[PDB]
Short mmCIF file of C-alpha atoms in Angstrom, two decimals:
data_model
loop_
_atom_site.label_atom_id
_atom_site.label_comp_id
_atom_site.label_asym_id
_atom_site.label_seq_id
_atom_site.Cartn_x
_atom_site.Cartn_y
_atom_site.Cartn_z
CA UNK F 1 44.68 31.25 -49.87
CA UNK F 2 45.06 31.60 -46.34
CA UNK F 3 48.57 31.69 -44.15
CA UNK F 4 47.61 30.51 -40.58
CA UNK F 5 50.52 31.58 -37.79
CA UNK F 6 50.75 30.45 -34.53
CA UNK F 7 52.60 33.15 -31.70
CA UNK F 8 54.57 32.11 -29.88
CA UNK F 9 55.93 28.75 -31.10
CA UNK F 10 56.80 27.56 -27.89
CA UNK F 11 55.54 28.45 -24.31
CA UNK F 12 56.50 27.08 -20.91
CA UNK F 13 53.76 27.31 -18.07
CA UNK F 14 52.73 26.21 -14.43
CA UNK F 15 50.78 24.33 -13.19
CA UNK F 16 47.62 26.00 -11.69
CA UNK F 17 48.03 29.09 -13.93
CA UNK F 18 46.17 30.41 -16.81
CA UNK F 19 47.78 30.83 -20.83
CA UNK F 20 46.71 32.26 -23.80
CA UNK F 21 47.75 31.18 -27.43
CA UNK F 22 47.70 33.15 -30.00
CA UNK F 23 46.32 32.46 -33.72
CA UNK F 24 46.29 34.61 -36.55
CA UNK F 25 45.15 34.47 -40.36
CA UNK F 26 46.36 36.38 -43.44
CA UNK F 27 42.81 37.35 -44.75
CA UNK F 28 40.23 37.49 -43.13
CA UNK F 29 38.13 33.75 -41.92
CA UNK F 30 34.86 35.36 -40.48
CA UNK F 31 34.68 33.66 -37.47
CA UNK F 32 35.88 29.53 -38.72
CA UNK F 33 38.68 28.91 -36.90
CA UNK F 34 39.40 24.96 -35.22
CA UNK F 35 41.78 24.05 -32.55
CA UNK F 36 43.19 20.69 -31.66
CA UNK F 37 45.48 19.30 -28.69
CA UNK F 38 48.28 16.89 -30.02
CA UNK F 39 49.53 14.41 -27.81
CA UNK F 40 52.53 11.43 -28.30
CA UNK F 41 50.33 8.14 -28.57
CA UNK F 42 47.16 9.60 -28.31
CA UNK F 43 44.84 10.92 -31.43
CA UNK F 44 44.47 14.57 -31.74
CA UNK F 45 41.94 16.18 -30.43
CA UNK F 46 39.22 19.07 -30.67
CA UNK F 47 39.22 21.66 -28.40
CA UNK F 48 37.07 24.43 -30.05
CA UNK F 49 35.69 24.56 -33.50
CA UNK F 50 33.76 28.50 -35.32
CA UNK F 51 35.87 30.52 -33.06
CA UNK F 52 34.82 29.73 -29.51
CA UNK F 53 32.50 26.58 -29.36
CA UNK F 54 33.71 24.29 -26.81
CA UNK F 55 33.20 20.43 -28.14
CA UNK F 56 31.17 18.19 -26.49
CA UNK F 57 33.52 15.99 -23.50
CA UNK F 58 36.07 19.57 -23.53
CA UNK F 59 36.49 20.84 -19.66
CA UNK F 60 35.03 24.37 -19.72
CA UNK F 61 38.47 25.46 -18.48
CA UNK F 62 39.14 25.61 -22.39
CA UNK F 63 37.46 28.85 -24.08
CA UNK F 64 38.54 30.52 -27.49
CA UNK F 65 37.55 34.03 -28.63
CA UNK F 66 38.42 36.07 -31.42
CA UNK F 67 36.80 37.07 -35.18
CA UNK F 68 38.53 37.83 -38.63
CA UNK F 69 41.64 38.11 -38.21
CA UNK F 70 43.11 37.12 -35.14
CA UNK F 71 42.05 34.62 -32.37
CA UNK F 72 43.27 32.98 -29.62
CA UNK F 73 43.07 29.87 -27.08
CA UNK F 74 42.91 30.28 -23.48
CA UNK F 75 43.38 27.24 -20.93
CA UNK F 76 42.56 28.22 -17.21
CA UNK F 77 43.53 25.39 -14.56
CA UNK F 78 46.77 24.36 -16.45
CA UNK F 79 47.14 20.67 -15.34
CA UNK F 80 50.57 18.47 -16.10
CA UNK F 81 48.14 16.46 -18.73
CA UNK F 82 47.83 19.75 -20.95
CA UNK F 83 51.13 19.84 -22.05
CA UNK F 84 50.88 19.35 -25.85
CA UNK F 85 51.17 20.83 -29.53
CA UNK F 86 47.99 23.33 -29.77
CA UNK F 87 47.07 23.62 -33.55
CA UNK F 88 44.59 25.87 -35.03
CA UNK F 89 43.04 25.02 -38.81
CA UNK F 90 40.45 27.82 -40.66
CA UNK F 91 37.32 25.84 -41.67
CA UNK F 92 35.92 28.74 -43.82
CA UNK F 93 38.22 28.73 -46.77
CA UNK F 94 38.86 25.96 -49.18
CA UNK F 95 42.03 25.23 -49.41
CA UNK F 96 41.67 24.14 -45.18
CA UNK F 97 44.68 25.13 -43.66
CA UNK F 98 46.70 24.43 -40.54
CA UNK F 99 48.83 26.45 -37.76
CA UNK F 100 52.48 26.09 -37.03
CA UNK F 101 51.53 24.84 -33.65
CA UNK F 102 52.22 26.23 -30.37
CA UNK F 103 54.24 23.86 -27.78
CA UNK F 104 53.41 24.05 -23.96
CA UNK F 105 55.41 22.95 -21.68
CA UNK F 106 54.48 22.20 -18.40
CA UNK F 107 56.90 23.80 -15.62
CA UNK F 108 57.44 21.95 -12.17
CA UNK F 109 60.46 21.75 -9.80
CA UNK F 110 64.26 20.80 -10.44
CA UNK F 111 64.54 17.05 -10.50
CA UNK F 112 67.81 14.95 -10.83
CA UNK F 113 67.60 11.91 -13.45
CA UNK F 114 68.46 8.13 -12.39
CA UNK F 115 70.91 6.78 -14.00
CA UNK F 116 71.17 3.69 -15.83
CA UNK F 117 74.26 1.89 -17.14
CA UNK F 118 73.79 -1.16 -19.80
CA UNK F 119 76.20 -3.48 -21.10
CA UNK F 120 76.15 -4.87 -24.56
CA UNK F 121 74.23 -8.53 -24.74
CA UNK F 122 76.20 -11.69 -25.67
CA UNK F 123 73.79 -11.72 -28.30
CA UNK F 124 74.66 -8.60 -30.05
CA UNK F 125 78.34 -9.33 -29.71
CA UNK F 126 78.25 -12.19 -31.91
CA UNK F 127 77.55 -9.78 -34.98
CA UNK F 128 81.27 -7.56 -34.19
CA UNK F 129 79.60 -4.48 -33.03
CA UNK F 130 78.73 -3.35 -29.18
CA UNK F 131 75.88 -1.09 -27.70
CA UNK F 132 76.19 0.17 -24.65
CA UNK F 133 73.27 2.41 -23.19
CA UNK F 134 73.20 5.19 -20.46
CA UNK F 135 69.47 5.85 -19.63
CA UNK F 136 68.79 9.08 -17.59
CA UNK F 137 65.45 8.63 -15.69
CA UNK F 138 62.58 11.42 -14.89
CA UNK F 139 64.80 14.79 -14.83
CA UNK F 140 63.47 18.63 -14.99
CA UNK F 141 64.20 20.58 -17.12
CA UNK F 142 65.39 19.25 -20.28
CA UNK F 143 68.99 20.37 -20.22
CA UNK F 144 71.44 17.98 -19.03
CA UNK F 145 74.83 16.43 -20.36
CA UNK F 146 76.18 12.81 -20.85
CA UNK F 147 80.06 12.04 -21.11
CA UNK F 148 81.16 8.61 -22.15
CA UNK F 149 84.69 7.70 -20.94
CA UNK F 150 85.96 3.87 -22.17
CA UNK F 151 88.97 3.72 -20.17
CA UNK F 152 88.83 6.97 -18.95
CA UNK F 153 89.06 8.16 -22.42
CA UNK F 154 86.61 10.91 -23.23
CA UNK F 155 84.25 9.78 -26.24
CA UNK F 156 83.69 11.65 -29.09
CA UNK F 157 81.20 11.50 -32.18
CA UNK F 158 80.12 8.25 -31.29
CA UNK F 159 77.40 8.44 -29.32
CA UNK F 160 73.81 9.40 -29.97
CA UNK F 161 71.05 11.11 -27.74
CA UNK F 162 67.19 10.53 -27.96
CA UNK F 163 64.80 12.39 -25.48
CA UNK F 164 61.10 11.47 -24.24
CA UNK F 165 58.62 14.34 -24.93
CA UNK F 166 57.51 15.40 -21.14
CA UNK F 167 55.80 12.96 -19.34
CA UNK F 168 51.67 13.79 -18.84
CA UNK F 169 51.61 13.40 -15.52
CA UNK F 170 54.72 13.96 -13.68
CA UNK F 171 56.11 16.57 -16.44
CA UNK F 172 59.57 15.18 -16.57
CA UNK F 173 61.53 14.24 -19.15
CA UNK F 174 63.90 10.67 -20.23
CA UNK F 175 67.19 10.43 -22.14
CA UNK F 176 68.89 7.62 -23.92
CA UNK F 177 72.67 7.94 -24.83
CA UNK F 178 74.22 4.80 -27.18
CA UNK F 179 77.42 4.30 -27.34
CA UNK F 180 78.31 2.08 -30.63
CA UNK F 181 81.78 0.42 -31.18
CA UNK F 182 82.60 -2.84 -33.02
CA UNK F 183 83.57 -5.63 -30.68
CA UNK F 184 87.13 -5.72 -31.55
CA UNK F 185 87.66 -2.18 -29.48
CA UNK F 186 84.91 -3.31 -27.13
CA UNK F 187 87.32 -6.40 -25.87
CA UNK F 188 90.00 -4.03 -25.69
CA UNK F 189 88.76 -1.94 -23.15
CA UNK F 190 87.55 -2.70 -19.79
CA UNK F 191 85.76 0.22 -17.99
CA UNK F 192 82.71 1.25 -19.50
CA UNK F 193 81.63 4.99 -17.72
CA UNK F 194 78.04 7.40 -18.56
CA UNK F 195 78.78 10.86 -16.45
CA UNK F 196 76.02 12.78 -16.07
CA UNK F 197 75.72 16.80 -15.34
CA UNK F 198 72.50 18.17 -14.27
CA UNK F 199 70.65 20.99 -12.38
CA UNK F 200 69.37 18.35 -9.70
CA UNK F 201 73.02 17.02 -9.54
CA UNK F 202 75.10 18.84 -6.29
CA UNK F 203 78.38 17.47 -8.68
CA UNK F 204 78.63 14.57 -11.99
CA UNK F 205 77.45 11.46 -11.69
CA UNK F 206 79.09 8.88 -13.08
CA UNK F 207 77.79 5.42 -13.55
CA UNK F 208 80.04 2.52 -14.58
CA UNK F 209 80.15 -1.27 -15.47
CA UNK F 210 83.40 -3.44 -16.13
CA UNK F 211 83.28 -6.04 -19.06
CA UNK F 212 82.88 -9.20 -18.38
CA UNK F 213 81.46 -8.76 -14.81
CA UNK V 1 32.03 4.75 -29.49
CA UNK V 2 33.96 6.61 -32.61
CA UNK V 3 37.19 5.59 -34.03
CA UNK V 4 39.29 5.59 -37.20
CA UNK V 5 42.23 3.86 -38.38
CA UNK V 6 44.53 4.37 -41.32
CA UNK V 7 46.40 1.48 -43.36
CA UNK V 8 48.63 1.71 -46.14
CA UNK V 9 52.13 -0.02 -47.57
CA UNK V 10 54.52 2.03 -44.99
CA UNK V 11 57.53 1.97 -47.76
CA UNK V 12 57.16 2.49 -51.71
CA UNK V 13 59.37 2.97 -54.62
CA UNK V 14 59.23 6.78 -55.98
CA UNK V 15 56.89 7.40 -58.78
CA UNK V 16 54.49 4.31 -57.77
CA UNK V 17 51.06 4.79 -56.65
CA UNK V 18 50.18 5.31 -52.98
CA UNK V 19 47.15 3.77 -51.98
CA UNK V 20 45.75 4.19 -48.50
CA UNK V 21 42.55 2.96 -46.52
CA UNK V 22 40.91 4.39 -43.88
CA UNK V 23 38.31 1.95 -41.55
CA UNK V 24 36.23 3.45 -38.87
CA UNK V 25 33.92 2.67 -36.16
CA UNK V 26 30.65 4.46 -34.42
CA UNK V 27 29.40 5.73 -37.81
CA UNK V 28 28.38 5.16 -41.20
CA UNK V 29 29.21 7.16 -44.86
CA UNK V 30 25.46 6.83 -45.24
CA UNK V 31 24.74 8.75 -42.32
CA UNK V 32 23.44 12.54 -43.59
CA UNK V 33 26.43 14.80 -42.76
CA UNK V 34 28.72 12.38 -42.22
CA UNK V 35 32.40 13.28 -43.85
CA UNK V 36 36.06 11.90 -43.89
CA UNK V 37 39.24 13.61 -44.70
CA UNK V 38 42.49 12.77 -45.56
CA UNK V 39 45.48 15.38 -43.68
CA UNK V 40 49.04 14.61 -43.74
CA UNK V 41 52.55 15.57 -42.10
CA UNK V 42 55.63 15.57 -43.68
CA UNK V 43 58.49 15.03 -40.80
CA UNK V 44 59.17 17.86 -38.54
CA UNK V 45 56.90 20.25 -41.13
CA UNK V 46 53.05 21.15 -40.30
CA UNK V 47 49.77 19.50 -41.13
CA UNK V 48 48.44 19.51 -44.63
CA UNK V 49 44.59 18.66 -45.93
CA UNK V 50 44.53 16.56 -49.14
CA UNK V 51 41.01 15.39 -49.83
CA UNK V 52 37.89 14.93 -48.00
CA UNK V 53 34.84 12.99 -49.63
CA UNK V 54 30.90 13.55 -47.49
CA UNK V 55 28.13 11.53 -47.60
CA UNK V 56 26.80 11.95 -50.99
CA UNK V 57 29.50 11.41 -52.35
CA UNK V 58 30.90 14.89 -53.28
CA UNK V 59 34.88 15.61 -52.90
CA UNK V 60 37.12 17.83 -52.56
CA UNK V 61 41.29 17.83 -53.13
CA UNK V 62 44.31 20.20 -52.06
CA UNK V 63 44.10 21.99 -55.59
CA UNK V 64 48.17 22.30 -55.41
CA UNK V 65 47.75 18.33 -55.37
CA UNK V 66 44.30 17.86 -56.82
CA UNK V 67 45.79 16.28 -60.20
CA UNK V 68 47.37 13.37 -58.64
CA UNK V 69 44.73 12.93 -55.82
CA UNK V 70 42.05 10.55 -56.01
CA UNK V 71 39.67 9.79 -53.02
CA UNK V 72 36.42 7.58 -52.64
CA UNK V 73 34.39 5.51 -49.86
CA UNK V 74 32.73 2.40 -50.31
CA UNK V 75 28.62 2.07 -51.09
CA UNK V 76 27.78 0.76 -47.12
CA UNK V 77 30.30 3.72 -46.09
CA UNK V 78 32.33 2.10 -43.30
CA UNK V 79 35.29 2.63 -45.77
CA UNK V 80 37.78 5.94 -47.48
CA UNK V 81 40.31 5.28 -49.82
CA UNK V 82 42.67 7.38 -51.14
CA UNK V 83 45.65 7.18 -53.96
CA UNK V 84 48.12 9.12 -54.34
CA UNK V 85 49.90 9.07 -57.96
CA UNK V 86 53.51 8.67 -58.74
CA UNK V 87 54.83 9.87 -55.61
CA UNK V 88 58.60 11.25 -54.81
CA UNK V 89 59.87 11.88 -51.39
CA UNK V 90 57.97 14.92 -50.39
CA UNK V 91 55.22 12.42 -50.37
CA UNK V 92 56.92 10.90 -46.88
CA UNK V 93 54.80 11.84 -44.38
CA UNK V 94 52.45 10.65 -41.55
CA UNK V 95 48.85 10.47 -43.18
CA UNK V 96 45.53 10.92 -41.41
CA UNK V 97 42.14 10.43 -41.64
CA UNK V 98 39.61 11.91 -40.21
CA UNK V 99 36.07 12.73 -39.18
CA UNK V 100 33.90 15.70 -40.15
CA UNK V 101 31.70 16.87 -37.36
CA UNK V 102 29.36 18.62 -39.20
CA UNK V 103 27.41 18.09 -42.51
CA UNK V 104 29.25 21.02 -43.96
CA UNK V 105 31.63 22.82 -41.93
CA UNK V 106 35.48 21.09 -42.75
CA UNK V 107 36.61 20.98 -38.95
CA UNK V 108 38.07 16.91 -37.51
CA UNK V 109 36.05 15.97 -34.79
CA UNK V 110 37.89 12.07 -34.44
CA UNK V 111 40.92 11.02 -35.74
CA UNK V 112 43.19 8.36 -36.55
CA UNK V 113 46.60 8.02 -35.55
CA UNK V 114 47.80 8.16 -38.58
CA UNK V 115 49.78 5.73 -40.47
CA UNK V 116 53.52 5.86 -41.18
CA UNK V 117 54.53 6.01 -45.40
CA UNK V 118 58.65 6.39 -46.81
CA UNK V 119 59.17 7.05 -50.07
CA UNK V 120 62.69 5.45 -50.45
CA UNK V 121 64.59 3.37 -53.32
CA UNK V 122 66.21 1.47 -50.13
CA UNK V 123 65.27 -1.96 -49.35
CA UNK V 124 63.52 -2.85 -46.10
CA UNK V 125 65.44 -4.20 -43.00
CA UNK V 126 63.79 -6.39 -39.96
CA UNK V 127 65.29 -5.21 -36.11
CA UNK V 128 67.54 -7.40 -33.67
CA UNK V 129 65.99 -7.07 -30.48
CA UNK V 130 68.80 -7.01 -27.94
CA UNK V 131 67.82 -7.31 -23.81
CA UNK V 132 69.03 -4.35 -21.80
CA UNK V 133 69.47 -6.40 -18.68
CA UNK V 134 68.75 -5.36 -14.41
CA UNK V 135 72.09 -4.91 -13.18
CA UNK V 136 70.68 -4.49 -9.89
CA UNK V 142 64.10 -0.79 -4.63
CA UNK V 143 63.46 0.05 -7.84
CA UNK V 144 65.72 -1.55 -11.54
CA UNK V 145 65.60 -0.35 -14.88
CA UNK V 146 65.24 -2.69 -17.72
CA UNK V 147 64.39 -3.17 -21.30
CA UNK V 148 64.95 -3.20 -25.24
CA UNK V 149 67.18 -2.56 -27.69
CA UNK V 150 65.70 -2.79 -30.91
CA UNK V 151 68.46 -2.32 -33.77
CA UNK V 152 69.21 -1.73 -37.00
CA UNK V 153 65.69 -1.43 -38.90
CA UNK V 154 64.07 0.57 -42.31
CA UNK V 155 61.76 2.08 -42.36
CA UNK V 156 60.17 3.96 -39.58
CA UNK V 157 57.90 2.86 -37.25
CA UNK V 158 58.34 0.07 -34.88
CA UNK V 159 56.17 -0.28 -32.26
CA UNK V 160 57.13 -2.10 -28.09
CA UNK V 161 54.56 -3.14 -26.34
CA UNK V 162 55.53 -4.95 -22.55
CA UNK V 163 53.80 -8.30 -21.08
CA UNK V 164 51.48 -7.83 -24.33
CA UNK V 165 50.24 -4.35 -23.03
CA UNK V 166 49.96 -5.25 -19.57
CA UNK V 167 52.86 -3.18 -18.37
CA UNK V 168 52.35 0.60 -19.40
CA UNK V 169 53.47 2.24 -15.95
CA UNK V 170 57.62 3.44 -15.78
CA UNK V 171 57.83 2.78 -19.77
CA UNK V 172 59.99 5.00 -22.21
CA UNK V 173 59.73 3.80 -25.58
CA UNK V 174 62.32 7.12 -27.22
CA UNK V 175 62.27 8.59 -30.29
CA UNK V 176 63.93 6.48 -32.72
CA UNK V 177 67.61 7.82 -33.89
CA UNK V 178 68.86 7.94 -38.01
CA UNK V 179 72.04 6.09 -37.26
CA UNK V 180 75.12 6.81 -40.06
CA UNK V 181 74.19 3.37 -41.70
CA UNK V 182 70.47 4.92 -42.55
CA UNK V 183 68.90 2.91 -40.30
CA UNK V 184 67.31 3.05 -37.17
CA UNK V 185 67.80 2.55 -33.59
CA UNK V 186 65.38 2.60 -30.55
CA UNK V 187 65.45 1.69 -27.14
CA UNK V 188 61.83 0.86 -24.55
CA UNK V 189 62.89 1.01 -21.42
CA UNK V 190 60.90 0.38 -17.96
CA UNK V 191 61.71 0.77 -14.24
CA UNK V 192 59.88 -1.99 -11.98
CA UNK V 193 60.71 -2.91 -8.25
CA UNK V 194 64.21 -5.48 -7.81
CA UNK V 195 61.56 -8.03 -5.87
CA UNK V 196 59.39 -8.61 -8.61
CA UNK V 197 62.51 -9.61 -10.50
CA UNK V 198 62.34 -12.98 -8.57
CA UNK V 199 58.67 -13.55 -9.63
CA UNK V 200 57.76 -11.41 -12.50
CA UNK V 201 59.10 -12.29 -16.12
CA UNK V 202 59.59 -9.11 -18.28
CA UNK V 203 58.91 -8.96 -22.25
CA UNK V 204 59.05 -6.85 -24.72
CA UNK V 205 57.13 -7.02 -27.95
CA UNK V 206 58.39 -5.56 -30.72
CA UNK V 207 56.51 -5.30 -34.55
CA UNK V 208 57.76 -3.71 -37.26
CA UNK V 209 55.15 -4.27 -39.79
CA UNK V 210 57.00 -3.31 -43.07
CA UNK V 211 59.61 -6.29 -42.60
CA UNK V 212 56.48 -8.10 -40.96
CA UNK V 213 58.59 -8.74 -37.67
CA UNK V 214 56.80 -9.83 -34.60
CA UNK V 215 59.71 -10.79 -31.92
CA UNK V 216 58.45 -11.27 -28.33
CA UNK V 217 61.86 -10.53 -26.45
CA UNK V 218 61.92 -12.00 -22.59
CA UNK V 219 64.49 -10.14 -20.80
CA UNK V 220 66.03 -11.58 -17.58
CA UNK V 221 68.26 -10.31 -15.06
#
């Protein structure tokens, strides 16, 4: 069959600009190659199907090229809604096969997160264990870290991280940290701290909440 | 206009059948050309086609697959099913059907957004929705939903009518085995005075539908 591989995996880009991705098959597929946009919450969609015809509703600003072998994908106004997985799939040869994907991100400027500081509810604590959440708001770029002190003890191993995938139209991203103790520690302790390093940050922020306030 | 959605059990034991449906809108099976496919992705691996079945009836099946496979439509054509036989956990995976756009070339012009199916031996567990409460222009609020199996769940605010400032996250594998998400959204602090906030939670494999309000 045919091995489909997608070059590079990962590409970051501005807004304004023009990229080109890059998608190549192990035998030869004439000229029946598909690509599709990806996008959290939203159905995937074609882009191109036989090599370089652009599907009905597609903004011209999307063209593909390429025969046989190799072909690639190139977007020309790069807006903040294009970031997304790019796939490619071969339409030629049974068995139909897909692309590794390419992810874009969309580049814009430095941006510090707002932060976010939540308690357990009374709820929860009637079950003997305690959540607390640090949420870091719209940030850019992706790399930040969160410290949770309990006393102005430094955590460790248990708290967990989830991020957003980059938001469509301002391109930044969102973080959730949870803290998890059982309530018989949570009563113990009395200062409940998230601190916060990032590139938008001039020093760490640290954002606090006292139990029982 | 053209759409497609994808049903199926969301949890099974290994080595049962998988059975999956796919409904659709703005066409018909009995329409020359028409086609659907079935495509699936395992987590954090790539896209994988299965089985598509056209118009007159004529099908095709990932041959690596092919002897478990079984796809068909119904006789109007508004329907695809598909089964997949006694599956084990490689069978986890997002599945998707889609639309042909052409009468023979095997390219997805529509979609679904797939449907969500575990493979697991463990029992299913409903969420606690817990409030994340405005502490104090602009507050953050929201939703902790806790402690579920399997994957998805799905937060909705004011019943859809509050998408702006939302963050639903990706939903974290705690060291129990089961999951934790939180949906958060920043509003303006004046429209805490006026505006109640809730968060609606499903999570269709323990068939839990909590509508959460969350005050300040």
């Amino acid at each position: 069959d045919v091995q489909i591989t997608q070059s590079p995996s990962y590409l970051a880009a501005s807004p304004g600009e023009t990229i080109t991705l890059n998608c190549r098959a192990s035998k030869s597929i004439s000229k029946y190659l598909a690509w599709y946009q990806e996008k959290p919450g939203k159905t995937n969609k074609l882009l191109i199907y036989s090599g370089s015809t652009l599907q009905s509703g597609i903004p011209s600003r999307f063209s593909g090229s390429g025969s046989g072998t190799d072909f690639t994908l190139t977007i020309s106004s790069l807006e903040p809604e294009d970031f997304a997985m790019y796939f490619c799939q071969q339409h030629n040869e049974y068995p139909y096969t897909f692309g590794g994907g390419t992810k874009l991100e969309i580049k814009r400027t430095v941006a510090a997160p707002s932060v976010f500081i939540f308690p357990p509810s009374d709820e929860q604590l009637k079950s003997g264990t305690a959540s607390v959440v640090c949420l870091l708001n719209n940030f850019y770029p992706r790399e930040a870290k969160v410290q949770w002190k309990v006393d102005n003890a430094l955590q460790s191993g248990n708290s967990q991280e989830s991020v957003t995938e980059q938001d469509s139209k301002d391109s930044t991203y969102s973080l959730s940290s949870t803290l998890t103790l059982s309530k018989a520690d949570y009563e113990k302790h009395k200062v409940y701290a998230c601190e916060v390093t990032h590139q938008g940050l001039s020093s760490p922020v640290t954002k606090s909440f006292n139990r029982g306030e | 206009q053209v759409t497609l959605k994808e049903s199926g059990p969301g949890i099974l034991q290994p080595s049962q059948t998988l059975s999956l449906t796919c409904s659709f809108s703005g066409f018909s099976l009995s329409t020359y050309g028409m086609g659907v496919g079935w495509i699936r992705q395992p987590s954090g691996k790539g896209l994988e086609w299965l089985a598509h079945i056209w118009w007159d009836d004529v099908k095709r099946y990932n041959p690596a697959l092919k002897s478990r496979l079984t796809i068909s439509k119904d006789t109007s054509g508004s329907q695809v099913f598909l089964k997949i036989a006694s599956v084990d956990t490689s069978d986890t995976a997002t599945y998707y059907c889609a639309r042909m756009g052409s009468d023979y070339d095997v390219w997805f012009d529509y979609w679904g957004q797939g449907t969500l199916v575990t493979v697991s031996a463990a029992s299913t567990k409903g969420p606690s929705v817990f409030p994340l409460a405005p502490s104090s222009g602009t507050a953050a609020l929201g939703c902790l939903v806790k402690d579920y199996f399997p994957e998805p769940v799905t937060v909705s605010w004011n019943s859809g009518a509050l998408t702006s400032g939302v963050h639903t996250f990706p939903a974290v594998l705690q060291s129990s085995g089961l999951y934790s998400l939180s949906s958060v959204v920043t509003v303006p602090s004046s429209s805490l005075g006026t505006q109640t906030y809730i968060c609606n939670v499903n999570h269709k494999p323990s068939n839990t539908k909590v509508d959460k309000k969350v005050e300040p």
